[PDB]
Design a protein around this ligand. Sequence first.
Ligand SMILES: O=C(Cc1cccc(Cl)c1)Nc1cncc2ccccc12
Ligand SMILES: O=C(Cc1cccc(Cl)c1)Nc1cncc2ccccc12
Lengths: 304, 304
Amino acid sequence: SGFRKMAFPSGKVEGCMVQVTCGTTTLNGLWLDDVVYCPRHVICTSEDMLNPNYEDLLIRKSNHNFLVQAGNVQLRVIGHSMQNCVLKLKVDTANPKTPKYKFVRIQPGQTFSVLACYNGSPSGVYQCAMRPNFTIKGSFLNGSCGSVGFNIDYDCVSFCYMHHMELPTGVHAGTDLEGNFYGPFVDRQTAQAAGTDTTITVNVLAWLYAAVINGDRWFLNRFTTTLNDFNLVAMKYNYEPLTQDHVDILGPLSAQTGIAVLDMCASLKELLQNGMNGRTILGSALLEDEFTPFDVVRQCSGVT
Amino acid sequence: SGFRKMAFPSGKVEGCMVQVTCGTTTLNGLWLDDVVYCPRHVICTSEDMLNPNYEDLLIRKSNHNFLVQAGNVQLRVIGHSMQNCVLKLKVDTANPKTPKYKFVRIQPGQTFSVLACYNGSPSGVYQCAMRPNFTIKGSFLNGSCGSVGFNIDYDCVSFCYMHHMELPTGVHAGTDLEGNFYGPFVDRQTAQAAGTDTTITVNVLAWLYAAVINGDRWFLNRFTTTLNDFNLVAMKYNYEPLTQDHVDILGPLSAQTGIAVLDMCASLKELLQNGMNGRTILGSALLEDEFTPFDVVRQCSGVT
Ligand SMILES: O=C(Cc1cccc(Cl)c1)Nc1cncc2ccccc12
Ligand SMILES: O=C(Cc1cccc(Cl)c1)Nc1cncc2ccccc12
């Protein structure tokens, strides 16, 4: 029993973290096989960041300008290339600690763990969701760039995020491991609109199922609703519209608890319309949307 | 910017996890140097758990009855001993992945990371506080026994908790690494009173300082209070009384923000008396007490 905002064990990713320095800028890099991946803005100074011409800034750099250090050991850089907003530094040594890995582009609403790093050294690990507007509400300071987000399936690390920037609003933006930003963001020091965000409805329903499994049942009611009716309420409260694909993913939790998905939607409907009334669910006084249906089942039934 | 319930990177602890089997019971063990530490109830069956005579149950076991497996490799057990509620299994091989480590007994109100494990395999990592009543509100299922709690100071792992039991209330109890339970708990399947719990006042104040640092300032007011006055309010709301030692630990956060500790107590006083008014602080709709003053500074200023 109990339900926590649990992250994947970070060991496999800690083994991949390196420090990358170019000029006077230092950030984190990800060393997988004989390649180190890092944000391309490692080649910028603060004067360059208003609107960098990355192709021109990179032409001024040679392999020997990229200093890569894995703890204490120095890596020899034998190639460099820019792919979208990431640099790929070919090194002469394959990382002996490279786990089995994949590069994936996650969908908005999915969750992942972040290993926050500074100077190539891991500082902490936390779990978060990719917002529907493609920002992440992380915890990052200057020098965290290059820290990565990931999921783990037994022995396989699926890397999904590399941290690049903090928007003036204090929320975070970054790329997949091919350097494509999630959302409309660009790697420039400009004010950039993050879209209207919404609450991840399928995750709130998953978390209500986790609450029932863990004994928090006070919000269950005598009602039911329809997808149509529920979606009018989702609209009013800035929740993602629920689809049959969401109801289908909630199937296992519905079977586990014996609570039909639309009956749980009627509980969510009443909580949106009436609030928590000074009560809590799984130690939260708000509706939590950072656990997917997969996360709840993994946490409540067990997977290593 | 941003503030998350951040855990320490778990890699150093993942390298120490093993599976321990005795008879038909399997749980997790911690392999440090040539010793494996695990809950002594690995020697019990379900018939034994109502009131085990641990000394007699252990006399029936020999070194060859304790099966220890580190991933795939089998460890040869050359000694066994019970110390309080833990078993220490001497193995013929020192763990090559033993980090620099210490065994510490944490105080109530302090925080630590938990690496939840099943069958010697890490499943996830989360941060939590040792409650003032010596329970932990973890997330654990059957087979999680032997999972450990820890803190990390650069390269040193200070192990503070080994998980033993889930109380009928769904909260968790365990021991320090010498096998002494935190709190009044005993390793028996009986209903056991956990004391009256309280909210960790110094941690709520630390988290209000983290909120101000991160831009959440709405709760700051024109008032101040005294330790005496604040403690009357702490009493009414089941908060730990604040002492000068707590005010002293909050010194760095007070200097960082320029907000005197007693002025922040007056903000906490008004939040206790008036509630959040449907507002949030650092994404929470309740007052958070799982971040110590050290955690806030480590997270807001940066340490690896
Ligand atoms: O935002 C950046 C640098 C940058 C600037 C403009 C564009 C790009 Cl691509 C990168 N760094 C930081 C990333 N996370 C958190 C931060 C917290 C405080 C200060 C900087 C922080
Ligand atoms: O409680 C125990 C076993 C036990 C019983 C009595 C006394 C002692 Cl010392 C140990 N296991 C579990 C530990 N955490 C979480 C659990 C969740 C579900 C089931 C068992 C769980």
